[PDB]
Design a protein around this ligand. Structure first.
Ligand SMILES: [Mg+2]
Ligand SMILES: [Mg+2]
Ligand SMILES: [Mg+2]
Ligand SMILES: [Mg+2]
Ligand SMILES: [Mg+2]
Ligand SMILES: [Mg+2]
Ligand SMILES: [Mg+2]
Ligand SMILES: [Mg+2]
Ligand SMILES: [Mg+2]
Ligand SMILES: [Mg+2]
Ligand SMILES: [Mg+2]
Ligand SMILES: [Mg+2]
Ligand SMILES: [Mg+2]
Ligand SMILES: [Mg+2]
Ligand SMILES: [Mg+2]
Ligand SMILES: [Mg+2]
Ligand SMILES: [Mg+2]
Ligand SMILES: [Mg+2]
Ligand SMILES: [Mg+2]
Ligand SMILES: [Mg+2]
Ligand SMILES: [Mg+2]
Ligand SMILES: [Mg+2]
Ligand SMILES: [Mg+2]
Ligand SMILES: [Mg+2]
Ligand SMILES: [Mg+2]
Ligand SMILES: [Mg+2]
Ligand SMILES: [Mg+2]
Ligand SMILES: [Mg+2]
Ligand SMILES: [Mg+2]
Ligand SMILES: [Mg+2]
Ligand SMILES: [Mg+2]
Ligand SMILES: [Mg+2]
Ligand SMILES: [Mg+2]
Ligand SMILES: [Mg+2]
Ligand SMILES: [Mg+2]
Ligand SMILES: [Mg+2]
Ligand SMILES: [Mg+2]
Ligand SMILES: [Mg+2]
Ligand SMILES: [Mg+2]
Ligand SMILES: [Mg+2]
Ligand SMILES: [Mg+2]
Ligand SMILES: [Mg+2]
Ligand SMILES: [Mg+2]
Ligand SMILES: [Mg+2]
Ligand SMILES: [Mg+2]
Ligand SMILES: [Mg+2]
Ligand SMILES: [Mg+2]
Ligand SMILES: [Mg+2]
Ligand SMILES: [Mg+2]
Ligand SMILES: [Mg+2]
Ligand SMILES: [Mg+2]
Ligand SMILES: [Mg+2]
Ligand SMILES: [Mg+2]
Ligand SMILES: [Mg+2]
Ligand SMILES: [Mg+2]
Ligand SMILES: [Mg+2]
Ligand SMILES: [Mg+2]
Ligand SMILES: [Mg+2]
Ligand SMILES: [Mg+2]
Ligand SMILES: [Mg+2]
Ligand SMILES: [Mg+2]
Ligand SMILES: [Mg+2]
Ligand SMILES: [Mg+2]
Ligand SMILES: [Mg+2]
Ligand SMILES: [Mg+2]
Ligand SMILES: [Mg+2]
Ligand SMILES: [Mg+2]
Ligand SMILES: [Mg+2]
Ligand SMILES: [Mg+2]
Ligand SMILES: [Mg+2]
Ligand SMILES: [Mg+2]
Ligand SMILES: [Mg+2]
Ligand SMILES: [Mg+2]
Ligand SMILES: [Mg+2]
Ligand SMILES: [Mg+2]
Ligand SMILES: [Mg+2]
Ligand SMILES: [Mg+2]
Ligand SMILES: [Mg+2]
Ligand SMILES: [Mg+2]
Ligand SMILES: [Mg+2]
Ligand SMILES: [Mg+2]
Ligand SMILES: [Mg+2]
Ligand SMILES: [Mg+2]
Ligand SMILES: [Mg+2]
Ligand SMILES: [Mg+2]
Ligand SMILES: [Mg+2]
Ligand SMILES: [Mg+2]
Ligand SMILES: [Mg+2]
Ligand SMILES: [Mg+2]
Ligand SMILES: [Mg+2]
Ligand SMILES: [Mg+2]
Ligand SMILES: [Mg+2]
Ligand SMILES: [Mg+2]
Ligand SMILES: [Mg+2]
Ligand SMILES: [Mg+2]
Ligand SMILES: [Mg+2]
Ligand SMILES: [Mg+2]
Ligand SMILES: [Mg+2]
Ligand SMILES: [Mg+2]
Ligand SMILES: [Mg+2]
Ligand SMILES: [Mg+2]
Ligand SMILES: [Mg+2]
Ligand SMILES: [Mg+2]
Ligand SMILES: [Mg+2]
Ligand SMILES: [Mg+2]
Ligand SMILES: [Mg+2]
Ligand SMILES: [Mg+2]
Ligand SMILES: [Mg+2]
Ligand SMILES: [Mg+2]
Ligand SMILES: [Mg+2]
Ligand SMILES: [Mg+2]
Ligand SMILES: [Mg+2]
Ligand SMILES: [Mg+2]
Ligand SMILES: [Mg+2]
Ligand SMILES: [Mg+2]
Ligand SMILES: [Mg+2]
Ligand SMILES: [Mg+2]
Ligand SMILES: [Mg+2]
Ligand SMILES: [Mg+2]
Ligand SMILES: [Mg+2]
Ligand SMILES: [Mg+2]
Ligand SMILES: [Mg+2]
Ligand SMILES: [Mg+2]
Ligand SMILES: [Mg+2]
Ligand SMILES: [Mg+2]
Ligand SMILES: [Mg+2]
Ligand SMILES: [Mg+2]
Ligand SMILES: [Mg+2]
Ligand SMILES: [Mg+2]
Ligand SMILES: [Mg+2]
Ligand SMILES: [Mg+2]
Ligand SMILES: [Mg+2]
Ligand SMILES: [Mg+2]
Ligand SMILES: [Mg+2]
Ligand SMILES: [Mg+2]
Ligand SMILES: [Mg+2]
Ligand SMILES: [Mg+2]
Ligand SMILES: [Mg+2]
Ligand SMILES: [Mg+2]
Ligand SMILES: [Mg+2]
Ligand SMILES: [Mg+2]
Ligand SMILES: [Mg+2]
Ligand SMILES: [Mg+2]
Ligand SMILES: [Mg+2]
Ligand SMILES: [Mg+2]
Ligand SMILES: [Mg+2]
Ligand SMILES: [Mg+2]
Ligand SMILES: [Mg+2]
Ligand SMILES: [Mg+2]
Ligand SMILES: [Mg+2]
Ligand SMILES: [Mg+2]
Ligand SMILES: [Mg+2]
Ligand SMILES: [Mg+2]
Ligand SMILES: [Mg+2]
Ligand SMILES: [Mg+2]
Ligand SMILES: [Mg+2]
Ligand SMILES: [Mg+2]
Ligand SMILES: [Mg+2]
Ligand SMILES: [Mg+2]
Ligand SMILES: [Mg+2]
Ligand SMILES: [Mg+2]
Ligand SMILES: [Mg+2]
Ligand SMILES: [Mg+2]
Ligand SMILES: [Mg+2]
Ligand SMILES: [Mg+2]
Ligand SMILES: [Mg+2]
Ligand SMILES: [Mg+2]
Ligand SMILES: [Mg+2]
Ligand SMILES: [Mg+2]
Ligand SMILES: [Mg+2]
Ligand SMILES: [Mg+2]
Ligand SMILES: [Mg+2]
Ligand SMILES: [Mg+2]
Ligand SMILES: [Mg+2]
Ligand SMILES: [Mg+2]
Ligand SMILES: [Mg+2]
Ligand SMILES: [Mg+2]
Ligand SMILES: [Mg+2]
Ligand SMILES: [Mg+2]
Ligand SMILES: [Mg+2]
Ligand SMILES: [Mg+2]
Ligand SMILES: [Mg+2]
Ligand SMILES: [Mg+2]
Ligand SMILES: [Mg+2]
Ligand SMILES: [Mg+2]
Ligand SMILES: [Mg+2]
Ligand SMILES: [Mg+2]
Ligand SMILES: [Mg+2]
Ligand SMILES: [Mg+2]
Ligand SMILES: [Mg+2]
Ligand SMILES: [Mg+2]
Ligand SMILES: [Mg+2]
Ligand SMILES: [Mg+2]
Ligand SMILES: [Mg+2]
Ligand SMILES: [Mg+2]
Ligand SMILES: [Mg+2]
Ligand SMILES: [Mg+2]
Ligand SMILES: [Mg+2]
Ligand SMILES: [Mg+2]
Ligand SMILES: [Mg+2]
Ligand SMILES: [Mg+2]
Ligand SMILES: [Mg+2]
Ligand SMILES: [Mg+2]
Ligand SMILES: [Mg+2]
Ligand SMILES: [Mg+2]
Ligand SMILES: [Mg+2]
Ligand SMILES: [Mg+2]
Ligand SMILES: [Mg+2]
Ligand SMILES: [Mg+2]
Ligand SMILES: [Mg+2]
Ligand SMILES: [Mg+2]
Ligand SMILES: [Mg+2]
Ligand SMILES: [Mg+2]
Ligand SMILES: [Mg+2]
Ligand SMILES: [Mg+2]
Ligand SMILES: [Mg+2]
Ligand SMILES: [Mg+2]
Ligand SMILES: [Mg+2]
Ligand SMILES: [Mg+2]
Ligand SMILES: [Mg+2]
Ligand SMILES: [Mg+2]
Ligand SMILES: [Mg+2]
Ligand SMILES: [Mg+2]
Ligand SMILES: [Mg+2]
Ligand SMILES: [Mg+2]
Ligand SMILES: [Mg+2]
Lengths: 147, 97
RNA sequence: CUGACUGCGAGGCCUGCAAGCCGAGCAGGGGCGAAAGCCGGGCCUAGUGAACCGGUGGUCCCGUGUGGAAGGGCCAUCGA
RNA sequence: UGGCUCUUGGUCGCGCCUGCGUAGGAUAGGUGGGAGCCUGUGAACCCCCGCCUCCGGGUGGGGGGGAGGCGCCGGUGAAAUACCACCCUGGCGCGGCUGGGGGCCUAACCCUCGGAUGGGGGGACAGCGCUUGGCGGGCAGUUUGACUGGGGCGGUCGCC
RNA sequence: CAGGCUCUGGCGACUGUUUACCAAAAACACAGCUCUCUGCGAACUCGUAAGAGGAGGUAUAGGGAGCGACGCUUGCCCGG
RNA sequence: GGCGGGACCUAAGGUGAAGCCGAAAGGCGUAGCCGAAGGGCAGCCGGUUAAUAUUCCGGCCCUUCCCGCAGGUGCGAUGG
RNA sequence: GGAGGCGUAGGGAAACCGAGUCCGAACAGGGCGUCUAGUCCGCGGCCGUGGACCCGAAACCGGGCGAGCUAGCCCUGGCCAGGGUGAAGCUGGGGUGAGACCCAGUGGAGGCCCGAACCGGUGGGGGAUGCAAACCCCUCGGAUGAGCUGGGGCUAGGAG
RNA sequence: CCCCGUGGUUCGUGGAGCCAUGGGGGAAUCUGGGCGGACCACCGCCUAAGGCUAAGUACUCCGGGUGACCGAUAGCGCACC
RNA sequence: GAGCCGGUAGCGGGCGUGGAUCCCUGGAUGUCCGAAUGGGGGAACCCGGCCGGCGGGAACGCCGGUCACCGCGCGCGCGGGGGGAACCUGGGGAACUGAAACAUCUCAGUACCCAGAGGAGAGGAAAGAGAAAUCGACUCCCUGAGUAGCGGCGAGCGAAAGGGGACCAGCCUAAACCGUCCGGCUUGUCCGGGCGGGGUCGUGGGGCCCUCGGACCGAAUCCCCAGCCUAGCC
């Protein structure tokens, strides 16, 4: 008797998988405890539809992030600050990088996503990863300049 | 020893036919019926307790139709059944047949 | 040497029925006899069992839309 | 009517190993492919351990050495050899799927608990459905002959 | 209105019970003896079942069978 | 109104919301209900009629419910 | 109204053939056939089928009706004159180291005694189209118990 | 649909199909499925597992019509309280 | 259309050509029991709830309305209950008897019990028949035919096709797809549940997608009427 699992179950199957078990183990254990539903036609259509919708929103995320990456990499964020020699008096942070990318170019970007462990305290040309979506990293070249 | 609540399966009346001798196909003289009596063939009735809308429903259903019952529960996923007594829920499920 | 025959059987004994009994002769292929002939078991009178059901061998007659098969029929013999 | 585990049994899926005549280098599974394969995916050979021992070996290994060795050739028998397949003989270890057993689990099912979408106990047994064989005057339907100096008992029953 | 008595046997220990309407007994019952079943959702009985009785009891208890106060006893045969 | 019975109570049993079982008919079943010669409840004597009386009448008692008055108290139940 | 029925062809298990056909190798011999009927209605005799000339069982089966008689049980009430015997215990005494136990008194036990009511029905006589489809007289058994009895209830036919 | 136990049909296990189904197993959607008497091939017929449908048919409590039916022991058990 | 107050005369009183008695139809009244149904109950009796009225009426009593249970449908509506001589279908289902015993067989799916329906009931539009290169729902009568077959191949049991007749009628759903309302949470091209549209076939039909074409039938339901029945008249 084929069933659709609801949770990952040890030595039996993964969540969402269609497995084959004795009718007693399903009627008197899996289905009561809400661990699996009957593999009927209706909820099989439902599972197919949920997989379709999940892959659809995943493709939406990856395509939106690919468009956003096509936006960047063809630009250099130039941030003027006050600095003496190569050391900056203040510090350019992710919040400041975001304020710059929204004031010029006009891109509202998530500052928490920008991989930046310590505030930028020196001048020059940097490359930082943005990562809006895993496996889709974005290289941003920022020119921290003075005056 | 009663009725299936899903298929309506009822006890039937069959005959017990006692036979002796060798069959003609096996080179024998033939089967001689040495007695017929009446007897009852009941369904394989069993109890099936399912949870529906929070209430416990019991079904006295023949074994051969245990899956059918679960179909009903599936088909009951779109009914206004909250608060109703077990008997009313059972009537609803049977009306879904 | 195998007539302890196969295909028949005029005509009778007996007799409620059904049975039981004797049987010349015609043909088929035979046995013995030089031949005439004889041989269809046993000097004779007991040594037995009707049908129904089924087994075996043969036959190739019927074969449930057609061709086959299943199952039966017919000939022979078995199970009192 | 289910979960787990152990244990044996059967079959397949792989890893596989295993096969002993005269003769013949030695212990030749079979039918083929087959005239070359193999070594830093480190050689002829040296010792220690499992394994099957037809008492000769076979083979998995390890370390040293660290680059040689076996085919076709011919000996040779029915079949003759490196190397590559497929498949048998029998064995083992993982596994499929099961047939028995042993052990455990709870959730079907059963019992119970001022408390019940629960707790506790039994537990896939018991009960019950269909089927198999058996026991079965507890009960039911019937049978249990004729002749005959009455019947019974004895004797008789067809044929010469 | 109101016991005849005594001696001595058989059977049943006793008071009881029974063939309404031919048998009141020596028959049945009986306390008591033994064998046997039953661990409790007991065995067993009634019922197709549900459910009851057993028992709101628990082996010093419940079912079955036999024997039948009590005294003294109750042997041999397990092949069917 | 006072005796007996009902407008009170329960017993075996009967019925029977819930619930369980059975081809049908129906069978069980806690609660509740019904169920009396049991529990509970207030009348005794005498007279009178052709025929009735603890029933009409006479004398002397008594109960229940409704309303009102006064006094008194946390009153109040199918539950304890 | 011609659907259909009977008759006009039989023989053969049939295939099939046909005044013939069957067994058979047979043109042999025999079986059954062929040398023509029929059919419809009325009536009568007898037959098959129905209850079949009429009356009669003991019985079998299905569904109901009965425990106002009787058997047992359950619930609730009631009745048993009078007399007799005198268990345990208690009390006092005797006894003893203490006891057992002995004696007197008190006590009022029992499927104990006698015997009415009440429940029975031993023996005899009567009765025998009876007073009576089980009675009458005499006598006799039990009568505080396994006693009797009123009312209300339950169990029935292969069942109680 | 197949197997096991049966019922129905003329069919009593018979060569036993067809219709139905108590138990066990258990499909497919026209290239699908059932039947034509085990079975197999060919050739046909048909379209299951949802439901309804007058009329022609059965009966006589009742009303009426008619008897080579009865005539008070007959005729319904009752002519009648 | 002249008598009348039943069978029923009498006593004692009345009515009718101003149309009585009598007959047909509708209506009113209809105590108590009974499916009996407010509750109980030993049928025709007993005892209540609520609203309204009566008596001097609060206690007591009378009056009128109303209150059982089950099923279906959003406290309220509709339906159900029981009876009926036979006839009908379904669920159960004997035995004597026959076989000159008896068990398979017969009697027989009869008797009876139970549930249900109706003036009828059942059945009915082919997953049929069976060999006809064929028929065309079902029911009923005749025939086929005591044939085919069944059967301790005993006793016995007993079809269908076909043909002749009576009658004559065919339909609605499920599913594909489409729409809508509702709610489930696992948020959607989702699943489920109502309703609407679409659709009903065997020469297979239907849905969807293209491509061409744009009134005649007619109920079994409803309305009206002839005819008929329930008194009579010449
Ligand atoms: Mg049997
Ligand atoms: Mg046979
Ligand atoms: Mg044979
Ligand atoms: Mg037979
Ligand atoms: Mg059960
Ligand atoms: Mg279950
Ligand atoms: Mg099944
Ligand atoms: Mg199954
Ligand atoms: Mg002769
Ligand atoms: Mg003769
Ligand atoms: Mg002879
Ligand atoms: Mg010759
Ligand atoms: Mg010769
Ligand atoms: Mg010669
Ligand atoms: Mg010669
Ligand atoms: Mg010669
Ligand atoms: Mg001769
Ligand atoms: Mg001799
Ligand atoms: Mg001689
Ligand atoms: Mg003889
Ligand atoms: Mg015979
Ligand atoms: Mg015979
Ligand atoms: Mg034979
Ligand atoms: Mg032939
Ligand atoms: Mg042929
Ligand atoms: Mg054929
Ligand atoms: Mg061929
Ligand atoms: Mg052949
Ligand atoms: Mg043959
Ligand atoms: Mg043959
Ligand atoms: Mg024999
Ligand atoms: Mg099992
Ligand atoms: Mg355990
Ligand atoms: Mg436990
Ligand atoms: Mg447990
Ligand atoms: Mg446990
Ligand atoms: Mg089991
Ligand atoms: Mg016996
Ligand atoms: Mg007997
Ligand atoms: Mg008999
Ligand atoms: Mg019989
Ligand atoms: Mg005999
Ligand atoms: Mg005999
Ligand atoms: Mg005799
Ligand atoms: Mg004699
Ligand atoms: Mg003589
Ligand atoms: Mg004489
Ligand atoms: Mg004798
Ligand atoms: Mg003699
Ligand atoms: Mg002789
Ligand atoms: Mg003496
Ligand atoms: Mg003596
Ligand atoms: Mg005695
Ligand atoms: Mg005694
Ligand atoms: Mg005495
Ligand atoms: Mg006595
Ligand atoms: Mg007597
Ligand atoms: Mg007597
Ligand atoms: Mg007596
Ligand atoms: Mg008598
Ligand atoms: Mg008597
Ligand atoms: Mg006497
Ligand atoms: Mg007596
Ligand atoms: Mg006596
Ligand atoms: Mg006596
Ligand atoms: Mg003793
Ligand atoms: Mg003892
Ligand atoms: Mg028991
Ligand atoms: Mg019993
Ligand atoms: Mg029993
Ligand atoms: Mg019980
Ligand atoms: Mg109990
Ligand atoms: Mg008990
Ligand atoms: Mg008890
Ligand atoms: Mg006990
Ligand atoms: Mg004795
Ligand atoms: Mg004795
Ligand atoms: Mg002594
Ligand atoms: Mg002793
Ligand atoms: Mg012995
Ligand atoms: Mg022994
Ligand atoms: Mg011995
Ligand atoms: Mg009173
Ligand atoms: Mg009152
Ligand atoms: Mg009362
Ligand atoms: Mg009360
Ligand atoms: Mg009461
Ligand atoms: Mg009852
Ligand atoms: Mg109920
Ligand atoms: Mg009770
Ligand atoms: Mg009283
Ligand atoms: Mg009283
Ligand atoms: Mg009083
Ligand atoms: Mg007084
Ligand atoms: Mg008086
Ligand atoms: Mg007074
Ligand atoms: Mg006051
Ligand atoms: Mg006070
Ligand atoms: Mg307070
Ligand atoms: Mg107080
Ligand atoms: Mg109180
Ligand atoms: Mg109070
Ligand atoms: Mg004829
Ligand atoms: Mg021939
Ligand atoms: Mg001739
Ligand atoms: Mg002739
Ligand atoms: Mg003539
Ligand atoms: Mg004639
Ligand atoms: Mg004759
Ligand atoms: Mg008759
Ligand atoms: Mg007659
Ligand atoms: Mg006659
Ligand atoms: Mg008679
Ligand atoms: Mg009998
Ligand atoms: Mg008998
Ligand atoms: Mg009876
Ligand atoms: Mg009594
Ligand atoms: Mg009595
Ligand atoms: Mg008393
Ligand atoms: Mg007295
Ligand atoms: Mg007394
Ligand atoms: Mg006294
Ligand atoms: Mg006394
Ligand atoms: Mg006294
Ligand atoms: Mg004294
Ligand atoms: Mg004392
Ligand atoms: Mg003392
Ligand atoms: Mg004393
Ligand atoms: Mg005394
Ligand atoms: Mg005294
Ligand atoms: Mg006494
Ligand atoms: Mg006494
Ligand atoms: Mg006395
Ligand atoms: Mg008495
Ligand atoms: Mg007497
Ligand atoms: Mg006497
Ligand atoms: Mg005397
Ligand atoms: Mg005298
Ligand atoms: Mg006498
Ligand atoms: Mg006398
Ligand atoms: Mg007498
Ligand atoms: Mg007397
Ligand atoms: Mg007397
Ligand atoms: Mg006396
Ligand atoms: Mg006396
Ligand atoms: Mg006594
Ligand atoms: Mg007593
Ligand atoms: Mg009494
Ligand atoms: Mg009584
Ligand atoms: Mg009594
Ligand atoms: Mg009883
Ligand atoms: Mg009873
Ligand atoms: Mg009875
Ligand atoms: Mg009887
Ligand atoms: Mg009877
Ligand atoms: Mg009897
Ligand atoms: Mg008996
Ligand atoms: Mg008995
Ligand atoms: Mg079958
Ligand atoms: Mg059959
Ligand atoms: Mg049959
Ligand atoms: Mg046959
Ligand atoms: Mg058949
Ligand atoms: Mg077939
Ligand atoms: Mg079939
Ligand atoms: Mg089935
Ligand atoms: Mg096709
Ligand atoms: Mg196919
Ligand atoms: Mg079929
Ligand atoms: Mg067909
Ligand atoms: Mg065929
Ligand atoms: Mg075909
Ligand atoms: Mg067809
Ligand atoms: Mg019509
Ligand atoms: Mg008439
Ligand atoms: Mg006349
Ligand atoms: Mg007369
Ligand atoms: Mg008369
Ligand atoms: Mg006269
Ligand atoms: Mg009449
Ligand atoms: Mg009469
Ligand atoms: Mg009058
Ligand atoms: Mg007058
Ligand atoms: Mg006058
Ligand atoms: Mg009227
Ligand atoms: Mg009433
Ligand atoms: Mg009433
Ligand atoms: Mg009222
Ligand atoms: Mg009532
Ligand atoms: Mg009022
Ligand atoms: Mg008032
Ligand atoms: Mg009034
Ligand atoms: Mg009123
Ligand atoms: Mg009705
Ligand atoms: Mg029937
Ligand atoms: Mg019937
Ligand atoms: Mg039914
Ligand atoms: Mg019976
Ligand atoms: Mg008869
Ligand atoms: Mg006969
Ligand atoms: Mg007979
Ligand atoms: Mg006879
Ligand atoms: Mg019979
Ligand atoms: Mg007969
Ligand atoms: Mg029959
Ligand atoms: Mg039947
Ligand atoms: Mg009848
Ligand atoms: Mg009715
Ligand atoms: Mg009609
Ligand atoms: Mg009709
Ligand atoms: Mg109809
Ligand atoms: Mg119908
Ligand atoms: Mg159709
Ligand atoms: Mg014919
Ligand atoms: Mg025959
Ligand atoms: Mg028959
Ligand atoms: Mg016809
Ligand atoms: Mg026709
Ligand atoms: Mg006509
Ligand atoms: Mg037509
Ligand atoms: Mg929808
Ligand atoms: Mg929505
Ligand atoms: Mg849906
Ligand atoms: Mg939808
Ligand atoms: Mg198409
Ligand atoms: Mg229509």
């Amino acid at each position: 008797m084929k069933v659709i699992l609801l949770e990952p179950l040890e030595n039996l199957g993964d969540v969402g998988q269609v497995v084959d078990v004795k009718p007693g183990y399903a009627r008197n254990y899996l289905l009561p405890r809400g661990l699996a539903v009957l593999a009927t036609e209706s909820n099989l259509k439902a599972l197919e539809a949920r997989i379709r919708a999940q892959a659809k929103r995943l493709a939406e995320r990856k395509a939106e992030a690919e468009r956003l990456k096509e936006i960047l990499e063809n630009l250099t964020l130039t941030i003027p600050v006050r600095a003496g020699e190569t050391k900056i008096y203040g510090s350019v942070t992710a919040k400041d990088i975001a304020e710059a990318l929204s004031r010029q170019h006009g891109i509202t970007i998530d500052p928490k996503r920008l991989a930046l462990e310590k505030p930028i305290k020196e001048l020059g040309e940097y490359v930082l990863t943005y990562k809006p979506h895993p496996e889709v990293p974005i290289q941003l070249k920022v020119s921290v300049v003075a005056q | 020893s009663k009725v299936c609540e899903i298929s309506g399966k009822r006890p039937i009346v069959a005959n017990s036919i006692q036979r002796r001798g060798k069959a003609k196909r096996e080179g024998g003289v033939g089967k001689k019926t040495t007695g017929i009596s009446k007897r009852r063939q009941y369904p394989n009735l069993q109890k099936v307790r399912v949870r529906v809308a929070g209430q416990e429903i019991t079904f006295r259903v023949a074994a051969s139709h245990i899956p059918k019952v679960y179909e009903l529960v599936e088909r009951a996923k779109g009914l206004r059944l909250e608060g109703l007594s077990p008997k009313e829920i059972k009537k609803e499920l049977l009306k879904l047949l």
